Amino acid sequence: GDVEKGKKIFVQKCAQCHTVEKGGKHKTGPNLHGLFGRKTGQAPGFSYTDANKNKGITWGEETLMEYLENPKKYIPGTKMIFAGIKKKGEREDLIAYLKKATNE
């Protein structure tokens, strides 16, 4: 989706718990840098729940389409607490900006 609205949804609902930038530190939420192509919960330095590590999917626009929709649904038992992004446009946008920054 839109990149900069993605950076908005990032600075709002993401950036406080996450780092998508290159060489970002781990936090309450994990470092998201290099998200696409990397399996769920594979980033060192952050302690994942087994729910996320056993998910083992490959993060992408569609995987985040389903996940960000209801993050408790897609990866049940995740210590991520969120009520889900119901809007699709928000998902596509945010994911797009992720595709920008995490690649950078």
Partner: protein
Amino acid sequence: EFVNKSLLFCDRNGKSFRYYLHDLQVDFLTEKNCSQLQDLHKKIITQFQRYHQPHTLSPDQEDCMYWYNFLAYHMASAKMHKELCALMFSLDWIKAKTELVGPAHLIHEFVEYRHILDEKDCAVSENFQEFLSLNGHLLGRQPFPNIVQLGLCEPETSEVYQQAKLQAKQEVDNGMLYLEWINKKNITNLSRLVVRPHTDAVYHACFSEDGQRIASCGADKTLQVFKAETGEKLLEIKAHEDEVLCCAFSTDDRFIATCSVDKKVKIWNSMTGELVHTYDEHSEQVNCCHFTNSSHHLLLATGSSDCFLKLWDLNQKECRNTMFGHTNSVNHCRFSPDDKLLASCSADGTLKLWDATSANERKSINVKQFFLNEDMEVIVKCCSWSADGARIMVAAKNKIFLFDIHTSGLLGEIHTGHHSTIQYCDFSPQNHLAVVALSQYCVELWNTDSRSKVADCRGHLSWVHGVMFSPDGSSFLTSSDDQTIRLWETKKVCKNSAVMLKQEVDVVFQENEVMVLAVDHIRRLQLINGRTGQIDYLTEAQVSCCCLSPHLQYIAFGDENGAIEILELVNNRIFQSRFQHKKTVWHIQFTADEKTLISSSDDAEIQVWNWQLDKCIFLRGHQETVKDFRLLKNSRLLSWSFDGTVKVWNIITGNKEKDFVCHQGTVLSCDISHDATKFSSTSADKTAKIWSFDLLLPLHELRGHNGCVRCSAFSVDSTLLATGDDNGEIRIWNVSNGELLHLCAPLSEEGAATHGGWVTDLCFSPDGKMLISAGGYIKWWNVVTGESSQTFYTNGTNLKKIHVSPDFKTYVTVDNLGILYILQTLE
């Protein structure tokens, strides 16, 4: 004619007219005719029996609702407990009512009418009183369970269990297949109340100042006002078009304003439900809504991302105060015990105390107390005022802090368990007790100036969103993501049996009989003998994982200290361990014999090591990482990884017979037909592919569900495929030529489900016709147009490594709560 004389009023809607009185007239008749009440009530009851039947009612009739609601009453005023006990104690009556009505009303009726009931009756009535209160979340909301089976989970002393067991025993040679619980007598502690009036999660819940009514807010975008005692539905008011962030009661409780995502604060009346005043100023969301605890004046503390602290005045149409500072968002803004002050608490590390009347700056505190050992940053979750009205109780990072406003520094410090970060904190004015939400749905009760463990709260469906105290000093309320508000007792929860089990339970096999081996929370393990209360507690260093050996006599467990520790059941003083593969060890398995340890970790190498020998043999797969393995009916070792590479190894020598890659990404375990080693499959989390070992690639591919695949099952003598999915759906597919034929939909068209969507291992029936599956609960399927049973249920959500007896009768399982579950099949 009575309408004409104006003694009675008539409302016209639908075909049937609706008659009712006016109050004064009612009280009048109450006074005029007194002695004749009994006559009347017994009259209408007698009539009712003479026409209809108690358990026979048509919901399609026009009189049903009234009967269901007030029949109990009409019996009560008749002072006849015999027909009363006859009606109420009946289970089917309960079933029908609950299905149509829901528990709350009925509960209320018990609580009220308990008086006329006899002394012995009080016990039974009580048993129900807790029964329904505990079952509140499950009942009345369909898909719907059996009454009997739920009654089987009750303590034997409870009349409910005795009646349920009675009827259970009565139905025989019935596809009902009832179950019995020996274990629940010592576990599943009682609760004061359990109430869910919600289709969605709870953001906040709290008791009124008078302790009467409850107004709850959540993702349902609807403020729910209901009774706090029996949980009857009072009023349902729409707060906003968007999710309500926070809500709280006022001084007189008569006014409740809501804040939401739409950035508009709307004042709602509790006894009306109509708009009173509305205030739109903030260009950002408002996370702070707090009212006054006194009748002196009325103010509202608000803050947002605009870095402004705005204090609203409920008397005027505008905002009273505006304050600079707080460069970051303010999480918790709360009034002091006096309205003359205002407390601002944010996670940026700035804790400020402002003058309300003077509007100037009183005190500003930055906490460097927490040591990071890259500027110092200390986040602040919540702020709770002490009963003294001076000290401030807060929780930061991994510890609890008690601040003094006089010294402005650190007055006191309370330790929190391990390294876990504190999610939430609250303090009780009585007994100086304080509850803390820490990690994994754990609400821990600690005492001030103690630093000793007081109480622990378990039995939740999910990690507690938040908890509060009922300021009667008696009890407290709990609210979680399980969408249910609960009432818990302080002194009752304080007692703990320490039955906690973390990630695992271990089954033991003695001939046909099954024995229980549990991994203890505190130190090492607890041994539970079958069909008896014999418990042998074994204490050692902490363990990461435990595994039982074939032929027994031994045990092999991995620790958090690394590698693998092997210990002998005969002598605990004798143990063997070797240091290899620094990464966390996951799966540990012996060969067909008691020798040749096979172990793996996260790495490109799998270790095969011989003990009493000390033979070191390393098997390299030359990949990014390796997940796990399993032993087949042969000496071959079937292993899988995150790279989707399925390998077949051998003992004592590294060998690769074939390489099977179904898809890209993590592949979950392996699925065999169990009829032979020929047919073999696995879950690639995309499609379902099976190979006969006739090629290096899977021969047959099944695309039936491409969204998610959690697991798959091949039933013996059938080979028909049962597909478990991430959604927790179990689909039945006929397999002959390796293609899709039949079709079934496990999901319900009744709409979204609350708890469920998890499956791990599937089990088979001894007949082969019946099927055993987990849809988040215990659910039995069947081949050829329809299933076996939806019976009973599984408390909680997450399940780990389902195991069963080889006779397929007695069962052993555990929930996410870590509670031992034992099933016994007896006719």
